[PDB]
Amino acid sequence: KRGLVRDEMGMPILNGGITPAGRPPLLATQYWVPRIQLLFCAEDPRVFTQRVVQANALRKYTEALLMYNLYVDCMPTEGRRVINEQSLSKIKQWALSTPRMRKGQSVLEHLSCLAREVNLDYERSMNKINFDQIVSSNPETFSYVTLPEKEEEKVPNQGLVSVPEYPFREQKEDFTFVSLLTRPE
Amino acid sequence: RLDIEQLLTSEGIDSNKLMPRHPDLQHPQTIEQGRDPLFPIYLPLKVFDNEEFDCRTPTEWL
Amino acid sequence: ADSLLKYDTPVLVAEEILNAILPPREWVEDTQLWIQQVSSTPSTRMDVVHLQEQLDLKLQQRQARETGICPVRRELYSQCFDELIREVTINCAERGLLLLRVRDEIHMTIAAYQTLYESSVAFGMRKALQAEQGKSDMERKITELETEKRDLERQV
Amino acid sequence: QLDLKLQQRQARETGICPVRRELYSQCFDELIREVTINCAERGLLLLRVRDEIHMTIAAYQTLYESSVAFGMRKALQAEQGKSDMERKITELETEKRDLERQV
Amino acid sequence: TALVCDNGSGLCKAGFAGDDAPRAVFPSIVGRPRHQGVMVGMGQKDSYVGDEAQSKRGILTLKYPIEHGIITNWDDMEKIWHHSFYNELRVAPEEHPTLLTEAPLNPKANREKMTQIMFETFNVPAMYVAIQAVLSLYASGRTTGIVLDSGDGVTHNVPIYEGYALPHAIMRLDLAGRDLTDYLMKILTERGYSFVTTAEREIVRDIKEKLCYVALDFENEMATAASSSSLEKSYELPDGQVITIGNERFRCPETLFQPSFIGMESAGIHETTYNSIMKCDIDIRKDLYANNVLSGGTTMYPGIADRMQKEITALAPSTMKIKIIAPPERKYSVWIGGSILASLSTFQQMWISKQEYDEAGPSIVHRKCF
Amino acid sequence: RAYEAIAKALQSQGETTEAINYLEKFVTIARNNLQSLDMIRACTMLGDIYNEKGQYSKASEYFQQAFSTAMELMKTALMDETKVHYGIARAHQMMLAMKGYIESADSNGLNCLLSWKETRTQI
């Protein structure tokens, strides 16, 4: 009540309170807490407020957005099975291809499972774009639902990074001219 | 001279709302209910708490 | 063989621009070739209206799936675009050049997007299956170490 | 002006590219303007193609991000299996080493 | 077609072969969302990587991959490469031979491991390895050179002769951009600006790019700075506070020549380079004096070329034309070299490739490669 | 038409309980007389009402009927809309458990979540 934080022996609880024998237990009104739980009097309450409300907003937005995705992930699309055969055969061939993998029958079985799963993902994505279109079209009919996020791109004014002018063609040519590496023998 | 309580209420948040709760299986809030979310806090706020704003590391604080 | 939009009068056995935008399609049977032209027909705004009608007729007639991807729908729109390039080119070669050029570039762009997706999922399962081989090597590790535990039992 | 822009921006000639998409978009729109001024219908149908293209590419982009979600999910599952492998490995190899050396 | 990816520890660069500049640049950092259950609920991707990770730096976890120029974790580095290829480069990695780069003297196992991970997981048919200084000399356009290289996490000197590195004369020094930022932070703390948070530390990095420069006659420069305000240069922080820096602007660079300010005892970079060429052979010493080339971020500081020219000449016998060269793009120049190198068609004949990769496989990065 | 307009005007004013009755009359007539397009539509509004009220089982029944009838009718936009509503109702059921798993944030909870994502099914 005074502002007199001390142990029950009246020691103002130093870090020494983590005794040489080890940490004491919880003392009744001690707590372990996250930073958001607390501010230190040396820091600007304005900023702490801004970050606290930002965190609250972000968490609410996120858990609603994931519930959005769960709604469309539940979408009972199974009656449509539109999967492009050439694409599947190609990605399968990619899948096996170059590595050391023993490609036993267990591999073929797993590949079949993965194929079925990606087929589901494929129609799932289709249903996603259907859902997004629908919710855009008729918001009030289900206004409780959120949209997904919307995002933008701005053309990087050159598709290559800035790196002020230099004789790049001349340097390349000179490298080809001097080097010994032009000879596979 | 500042008070966090009046700032946080002026943003609109009762601090007591911030904590995760058990769902009241007695009366699960239907969307009609008019709460801001579909359901109160459940993801721990500690997930989103971002060190972007702090001026000092915990070691610095110590 | 057939093509459902304004390929002209098969022959069985601007015009440079009219070929260049769109090769006159071919098929051959028993060594006998049908070459079906891109005519210099200066088609009309009314023909445009008729194409609009006939295209939406096709679209509903097959019931091409509309929102999101649909190969049938995309191909129909490609036919529309091909007729539009023909019409412009017959009106003016240059305008048709730019239109066809953009048509090609965007076609390659969609091809790239598909290739990207295909390979990205390829990476995804290639990780999954590499990890599954790693789990098979776990099976090896546990089984051989179990035989080594039998060896340790023999050693005790 | 197209070729000037493409050079001065230093466009990525192939593959995905912001610069190429935006530039091709503007010159496409300009030619749609020309067409419409010659004939509304021709340009209107060109616009319909423009829409179909645009939504198609948007769909493929969404499908790609779904691919990314697949990749993350399955990686996380298989690497959690790898964590179960590491968990068993640490005890297994500890027992192997101490049992062998003590023997 | 070919790809080039490079890591001067500080920032990493991604580019299409033969281009006069890389197509993207992004900083050498990875970050995972701190609640995996939320991530799998979202489907939000495995990690933020590149600058957006910085944008989120507080909201998540962050970690560095290539500390002191060496791989701290493979799995992080492969996540970097994944992000590079798909987000920056968009291409299918399976379809484009790819170049990856390393600090010198990399412990042998790391080369093999790196190869294995690239070939097997990323599935490109062919790939090649290079040691950063070697590519930076290619950008300079000599086979015959002594390189100074400093990306913010490490610094090295490297003699290279007709396109090979004479190993024994290589030296490491563990004094790089991070260390310079920390020393600058300390001395500004002595002024009373007391930057400590990651955000502030980034501001320090920006100050290093904006206002540092080497002294020539350091003790004279320091005296003149003490004599007068005229040397002052001011800057305003993002928060709109104004901060003022004198002697400190050149003093901070001095640590490179003057590591006793860091309390480390190996002689300064100029000395180390001299001692390296002394490890090299008089037969080739002249050409080494002929081509001193500066690489990597720390070379960004104005005037360093002249300071090195003087201090090397003093440490050298005064019997050669010393020539510093500081190719304008020297930090990018490492990647520029790789871009031109991979452009060379014969390197396609150098390619390590899947068919060999089965039998000759992991070992050939030791055996075939350079 | 009158029953529909009444139902909408009630819902305009939150008198939704009575709107249920008028919707049930309308659906009865449209079903018995096989105005299936409008029967689907009215069933959709019924499902929506029970959904906001919370009877997710009821709402899912209404959406299942509406979707199946539309699938007989093949009016694709109706298919999409009924699919969306059916999915939402099922999701409102499923989320209680999945939320539990997500908060449990553990080897079992995660293995459940992954198992569902692959299967689309529970344990």
In angstroms, what CA-CA distances link F69 with A76, B60, F34, F39, F66? 15, 67, 11, 9, 5
- Contact of E19 with E329, CB cutoff 8 Å: no
φ/ψ of C25, rounded to 5, equals -65, 155
Are the Cβ atoms of F102 and E36 closer than 8 angstroms?
no
Residue C32 CA to residue D63 CA, distance in Å, equals 44
Q: Give the torsion sign (CA, E175, E178, E184, E185).
A: negative
Residue C99 CA to residue C105 CA, distance in Å, equals 10
**Chain E interface disruption, residue of B46, B48, B56, most E CBs within 10 A:** B48
Give the count of alpha carbons within 13 A of A66, CB side only: 22
Residue E58: name the closest of E198, E169, E213, E203 by CA. Answer: E198
In angstroms, what CA-CA distances link E325 with E78, E137, E140, E259, E299? 35, 11, 9, 23, 11
Contact of E60 with chain C, judged by CB distance below 8 Å, is answered with no
Length of chain E: 370
Max distance between CA atoms of chain E, in angstroms, equals 70
Residue with the two structure tokens 């990314």: D68
Residue E99, judged by CB atoms within 10 A of its CB (0-12, 13-18, 19+), counts as: buried
CA-nearest residue to E95 within chain D is: D15
Write out the two tokens for E161: 């002769």
CB nearest to F52's CB, from B30, B39, B43: B30
Residue C80 CA to residue C91 CA, distance in Å, equals 17
Residue E280 CA to residue E273 CA, distance in Å, equals 10
Q: What is the DSSP string of E191-224?
A: HT----SHHHHHHHHHHHHHH----SSHHHHHHH
CB atoms within 10 A of CB A28: 7
Residue B3, judged by CB atoms within 10 A of its CB (0-12, 13-18, 19+), counts as: exposed
Q: Is C83 strand, coil or helix?
A: helix
Element (H, E) at A179: none
Three-class SS of B1-62: CCCHHHHHHHHCCCHHHHCCCCCCCCCCCCHHHCCCCCCCCCCCHHHCCCCCCCCCCHHHHC
Q: Is E145 strand, coil or helix?
A: strand
φ/ψ of A168, rounded to 5, equals -55, -45
Q: What is the DSSP string of A53-96?
A: HHHHHHHHHHHHHHHHHHHHHT---TT-----HHHHHHHHHHHH
Neighbouring chains to A with at least 3 Cβ pairs closer than 8 Å: B, C, D, E, F
Q: How far is E48 from chain B (nearest CA, A)?
A: 15
Contact of D32 with chain C, judged by CB distance below 8 Å, is answered with no
Counts for chain F of helices (H) and strands (E), in that order: 6, 0
- Contact of C48 with C70, CB cutoff 8 Å: no
Residue A154, judged by CB atoms within 10 A of its CB (0-12, 13-18, 19+), counts as: exposed
Give the count of alpha carbons within 13 A of C87, CB side only: 24
Residues of chain E with Cβ-Cβ distance to A54 below 8 Å are: none
The radius of gyration computed from the CA coordinates of chain D, to the nearest angstrom, equals 28
> Please, what's the b/e burial string for A156-174 (b: 16 or more CB within 10 A of its CB; e: otherwise)?
eeebbbebeebebeebbeb
In angstroms, what CA-CA distances link E75 with E80, E188, E366? 9, 37, 21
Write out the two tokens for D22: 């935006």
In angstroms, what CA-CA distances link C149 with A121, C136, C138, C142, D101? 44, 19, 16, 10, 13
CA A21 from chain centre, in angstroms, equals 43
In angstroms, what CA-CA distances link D19 with C116, D7, D64, E18, E353? 18, 11, 20, 19, 34
Element (H, E) at C61: helix C45-62
Residue with the two structure tokens 């110590």: B62
Instruction: List residues bridging with E102 in a β-sheet.
Output: E131
Q: Which residues of C touch F (CB under 8 A)?
A: 63, 65-67
Contact of F9 with chain E, judged by CB distance below 8 Å, is answered with no
CB nearest to F52's CB, from B23, B31, B39: B31
Residue F70 CA to residue F67 CA, distance in Å, equals 5
In angstroms, what CA-CA distances link F57 with E229, F50, F51, F60? 80, 9, 9, 5
Residue with the two structure tokens 């100029």: E270
Residue E177 CA to residue E9 CA, distance in Å, equals 10
- Contact of E364 with E352, CB cutoff 8 Å: yes
Contact of A68 with chain F, judged by CB distance below 8 Å, is answered with no
Residue F60 CA to residue F84 CA, distance in Å, equals 11
Residue C50 CA to residue D26 CA, distance in Å, equals 29
Element (H, E) at E104: none
Write out the two tokens for E243: 């901060």
Residue B45 CA to residue A60 CA, distance in Å, equals 10
- Contact of F26 with F42, CB cutoff 8 Å: yes
Are the Cβ atoms of A129 and D17 closer than 8 angstroms?
no
Q: What is the DSSP letter of C11?
A: E
Residues of chain E with Cβ-Cβ distance to B54 below 8 Å are: 58, 197
Q: How far is A163 from chain E (nearest CA, A)?
A: 6
Residue E48: name the closest of E15, E85, E89, E80 by CA. Answer: E80
Contact of A95 with chain C, judged by CB distance below 8 Å, is answered with yes
Write out the two tokens for E225: 């700075």
- Contact of D49 with D41, CB cutoff 8 Å: no
Write out the two tokens for F79: 């298919």
Strands E233-236 and E324-325: unpaired
Max distance between CA atoms of chain B, in angstroms, equals 48
Q: What is the DSSP string of F52-70?
A: HHT-HHHHHHHHHHHHHHH
CA-nearest residue to F75 within chain C is: C63
Are the Cβ atoms of C66 and F76 closer than 8 angstroms?
yes
Contact of E316 with chain D, judged by CB distance below 8 Å, is answered with no
- Contact of C88 with C100, CB cutoff 8 Å: no
Residue C135 CA to residue C132 CA, distance in Å, equals 5
Residue E89 CA to residue E82 CA, distance in Å, equals 10
Instruction: List residues bridging with E149 in a β-sheet.
Output: E156, E295
Q: What is the DSSP letter of E123?
A: -
Instruction: List residues bridging with E325 in a β-sheet.
Output: E293
Q: Is C34 strand, coil or helix?
A: strand
Residue with the two structure tokens 């390979």: C119
CB nearest to C45's CB, from D34, D41, D48: D41
The letter for the amino acid at D55 is M
Please name the method used to determine this structure.
Answer: cryo-EM
Residue E299: name the closest of E332, E326, E324 by CA. Answer: E326
- Contact of E66 with E152, CB cutoff 8 Å: no
Residue D21 CA to residue D18 CA, distance in Å, equals 5
CA-nearest residue to C69 within chain D is: D56
Length of chain B: 62
- Contact of E53 with E198, CB cutoff 8 Å: no
Strands E242-245 and E233-236: antiparallel
Residue F121: name the closest of A111, A120, A66, A79 by CA. Answer: A120
- Contact of E155 with E103, CB cutoff 8 Å: no
Terminal Cα distance for chain B, rounded: 25
Write out the two tokens for A95: 């899948």
Residue C121 CA to residue C127 CA, distance in Å, equals 10
Residue E329 CA to residue E139 CA, distance in Å, equals 9
Counts for chain D of helices (H) and strands (E), in that order: 3, 0
Residue E300 CA to residue E292 CA, distance in Å, equals 16
Residue with the two structure tokens 């009104």: A29
Contact of A144 with chain B, judged by CB distance below 8 Å, is answered with yes
Instruction: List residues bridging with E101 in a β-sheet.
Output: E130
Q: How far is E352 from chain A (nearest CA, A)?
A: 13
Helix axes A105-137, A45-73, angle to 10 degrees: 110
Residue A162 CA to residue E22 CA, distance in Å, equals 9
Residue F21 CA to residue F25 CA, distance in Å, equals 6
CA E28 from chain centre, in angstroms, equals 11
Instruction: List residues bridging with E99 in a β-sheet.
Output: E4, E128
Q: Is E49 strand, coil or helix?
A: strand
The letter for the amino acid at A12 is P
